[PDB]
Structures are given as structure tokens and as C-alpha cells.
Amino acid sequence: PGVFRVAVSSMISPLETMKGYGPVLSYIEQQTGRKVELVQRRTYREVNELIRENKIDLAFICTYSFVEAELFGARPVAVPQVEGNPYYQAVVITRRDSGINSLEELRNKRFAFTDPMSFSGHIALRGELVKVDRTPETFFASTFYTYSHDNSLRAVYDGIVDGATIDSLVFRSSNILYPEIGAALQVVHVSPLVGAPPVVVSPGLSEEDYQLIRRAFLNMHNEPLGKQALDTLFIDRFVMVNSGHYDYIREIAGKI
């Protein structure tokens, strides 16, 4: 049978992407009987275009990318239930010594985003500025897309930008690994809660292949090779998507 292609962003875990995904790819080979190819792209836009053009079978995407991918018929497989069952939100960070202690105090300041199609790294904040009839372009003095939550955090720490919007779990993890960097930073604003990042299939994937891969993900925690894949990714199990968990993103997507 034909190769089974899995698409991911290269910028979540630079130099450790195949290290992290290797076991789940082996699990997909076991459950499908198909050779699996890992397809990496730097930007969420590039990953979404692979899904739209049916150039891949399965993709690990995030919340705004999922909202956009649904509109061209990408179908949800499952979401991860991560250890500790975290909640998902954007945090806006500044330096404690900046004197910038709120989102409103970042007007006319320098600001870092990650990926234009990131919720926690862009869209959450673009959505909130609608409240005051602004865009990032008409609110901040300048903006930059780093394509990395860690690099956005580093840019705030080094004073290259005045603030950034990043994933709450990256902030938490960074503060454990680099406590001296974390100590210099403050969360000045938090976004609404959204769902876990979903796994999707291409609109062109057969119903048979869709049902097979959905069963494989939802039963992964009950299979020995599945348990190894889940441990490697620090996921407890995959569970069914709750479409409601992304409605805030759908709403701000329509306000721009």
C-alpha cells in the first residue's frame, strides 16, 4: 500500500522532532501496515496548504490552524490529554524592570508574535485589540514574527521587544528549565481558554482510512507500542475533539 504522510511544524522542537514523533510514527505503521513519512514545515500556513492539497494524510496542527483547516474540509481525529490535564491559553509577558505592567501599557511599544497562524502566538492578541478598534499594526510601534515561543520569550528577556504573546505551557516549561530568565519576566495579561491542539486528516483521506486512524489514536493508550509513543510525547491518551472548545477562535476569526 501507499506511503502514509504525517505533517508537523519543525519549530515546536527544533532538532528533536523525529526524536519526539518516532514512536508514534512506528505505532501508525503497526496499525495501518503503511510506511510512514514525517513531513516537516517551518510555518503553519505551509502545513495547512499540504492538508488542503491532499499532499499528506495526517497532521498535528494547533487551534487557529484547525479552525482554518475545517473550512477546507480537514476532519478532526483526536486531541491529546496531556499529563496533569492542563488548560490552554495565551500569556502576554514583559520584563519586571520594564515598567510595562498591562497589555494597555504596550501601546506604541515593540511586540513579538510567533507564527501568523498561531492562536497563543498571534491571533488571541489580534482578537483582543478589536475591543479598542485597533490591530497590532495600529496598536504597537512595531511587530515581528519569530516563529518560536522560546525565541519570543528570549527577545522580551534581552529587551529586543517590550512584550510577547506565547503559549502558557511554554512559559511554564521555560521557567522550570531557565529559572533566571523566568524570574526577570511577568505575565501582564492572559487570553480566554481554548481546546488542546487537534490531530486532523486531509479532506481527501478515505472514510475507511479516517475510521482506522481515529480508532488507532483513541485506543493508543491500550496498545503496548501506543503506550511507548504516548510516554515519548508526555501525553496520557488521545480523546475525541469537543468542537465547542474552539468557538472563541471561530468568533474572533470572523472579527479579524
Side-chain angles (χ1 to χ4, degrees):
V3 172
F4 188 98
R5 298 192 176 82
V6 175
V8 306
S9 65
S10 62
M11 286 307 297
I12 293 168
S13 64
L15 296 170
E16 297 187 311
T17 303
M18 180 55 81
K19 177 143 171 274
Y21 277 102
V24 78
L25 305 183
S26 292
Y27 174 69
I28 294 166
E29 292 193 337
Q30 178 186 60
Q31 297 306 310
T32 65
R34 297 164 68 172
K35 275 198 74 78
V36 167
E37 177 196 329
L38 186 61
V39 181
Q40 302 195 42
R41 296 289 187 277
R42 182 179 55 102
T43 77
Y44 276 135
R45 183 162 275 97
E46 285 170 288
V47 176
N48 263 24
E49 287 306 294
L50 292 175
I51 307 174
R52 185 206 298 278
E53 294 172 24
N54 293 134
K55 293 190 177 297
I56 61 84
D57 299 292
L58 185 75
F60 290 81
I61 59 173
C62 207
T63 60
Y64 178 77
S65 293
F66 169 62
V67 160
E68 293 301 282
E70 272 189 322
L71 300 173
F72 59 75
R75 287 161 285 159
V77 177
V79 286
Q81 178 187 293
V82 170
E83 288 177 6
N85 243 129
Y87 289 86
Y88 295 85
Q89 68 186 163
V91 297
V92 179
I93 54 160
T94 69
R95 283 184 63 92
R96 294 182 179 280
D97 69 5
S98 73
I100 307 173
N101 305 308
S102 63
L103 176 58
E104 83 179 19
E105 288 169 60
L106 281 163
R107 194 181 290 259
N108 311 313
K109 303 295 180 180
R110 305 162 303 180
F111 202 78
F113 295 126
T114 64
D115 184 307
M117 289 192 68
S118 177
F119 175 77
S120 63
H122 178 220
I123 296 296
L125 197 134
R126 184 168 291 262
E128 292 211 31
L129 289 180
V130 175
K131 172 178 220 70
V132 295
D133 191 31
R134 292 290 186 281
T135 65
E137 290 80 12
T138 63
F139 185 81
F140 302 113
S142 65
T143 63
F144 191 77
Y145 295 80
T146 64
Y147 292 87
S148 163
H149 293 270
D150 284 309
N151 291 356
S152 290
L153 187 154
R154 184 76 213 192
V156 174
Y157 179 69
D158 290 336
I160 290 169
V161 297
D162 298 303
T165 182
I166 60 166
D167 176 80
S168 60
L169 281 152
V170 174
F171 187 65
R172 172 185 145 73
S173 178
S174 178
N175 291 356
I176 293 163
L177 297 175
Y178 311 96
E180 297 167 72
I181 294 167
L185 300 180
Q186 53 175 166
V187 174
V188 299
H189 184 79
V190 297
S191 80
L193 299 185
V194 300
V199 183
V200 304
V201 296
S202 167
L205 190 78
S206 72
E207 184 65 11
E208 188 189 352
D209 284 349
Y210 175 58
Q211 290 302 151
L212 176 56
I213 199 67
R214 188 153 69 79
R215 195 189 330 125
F217 271 70
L218 296 175
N219 195 228
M220 190 183 301
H221 62 285
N222 296 323
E223 290 296 351
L225 195 53
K227 289 178 196 166
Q228 298 187 330
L230 287 169
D231 291 357
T232 303
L233 290 168
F234 300 93
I235 301 166
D236 288 336
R237 57 173 71 186
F238 287 95
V239 297
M240 283 175 292
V241 181
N242 183 338
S243 183
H245 289 3
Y246 315 94
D247 277 336
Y248 175 69
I249 305 177
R250 292 196 185 89
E251 189 158 312
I252 62 174
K255 298 175 180 297
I256 313 304

